[PDB]
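User: Please predict the structure of the protein below. I'd like the answer in structure-token form so I can feed it into my own downstream comparison script.

Assistant: Understood. Taking the following sequence of 280 residues as input:
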Amino acid sequence: GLSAAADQTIKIGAQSMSESEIIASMLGQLIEHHTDLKTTTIKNLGSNAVQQQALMNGEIDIAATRYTGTALTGTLRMEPEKDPDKALALTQREFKKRYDLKWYDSYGFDNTYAFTVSKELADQYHLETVSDVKKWAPQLKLGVDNYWMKLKGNGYQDFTKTYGMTFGGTYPMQIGLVYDAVKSGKMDIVLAYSTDGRIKSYGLKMLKDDKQFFPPYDCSPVVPEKVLKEHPELEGIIKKMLGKIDTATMQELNYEVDGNLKEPSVVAKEYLEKHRYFES
């Protein structure tokens, strides 16, 4: 019954990324700071598509981190809108229309796929943009996550159509591994994620996507409207995180996990303490 609503646990899902574990912990700890609700973390969801199915089948009550261009090309099966604002606004309307899901405004950061080389290779061959690598592509080994080569929309297939290049070799691996793979010289180029802490720490060079092949990847929490109606306090709490975490911040938090080997929960707790749980 409704009067027992506050006794239900709020299950917050995390994709298999350090970023998504940090944000899901941060949002869980903010909810518990403000309310009597219990929360749990539902970790290792493999991909955007898994998070979507978990929202629709009750596995998770909140997706902590979803990304506009991933949702636009992959869930919605729409062509990639290139403007951040327009892509957010389309994703929010289509998520509400199709699924009764509320896609919030962004936390403040975008986490894009980004073709990434060592500083040494970039310096040697004057590489600044992805188009710069077209003449070298047959001599390059690309390290990539275990999903993007297979994607029908805006994945490797469409990339080779847009840029007109095919890499000598492609090597799918857990995303976390690509940073040391390119830094150690095992891969020549990697499809990194821009918010990873190791891009700055390892001094890697992200190549400009000169053709704007990629859509924006602004990061937001997503919640079923039914969950918000039943727990009317959740909207005001989620709002406290929106627009508060910029790219530089998110990179520092990811570095604390992947570089400083802290637990995502501890990294999230230290950050909430530092910033007084977003109200001073």
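That's the full token string. The first strand starts at residue 10 and ends at 15.
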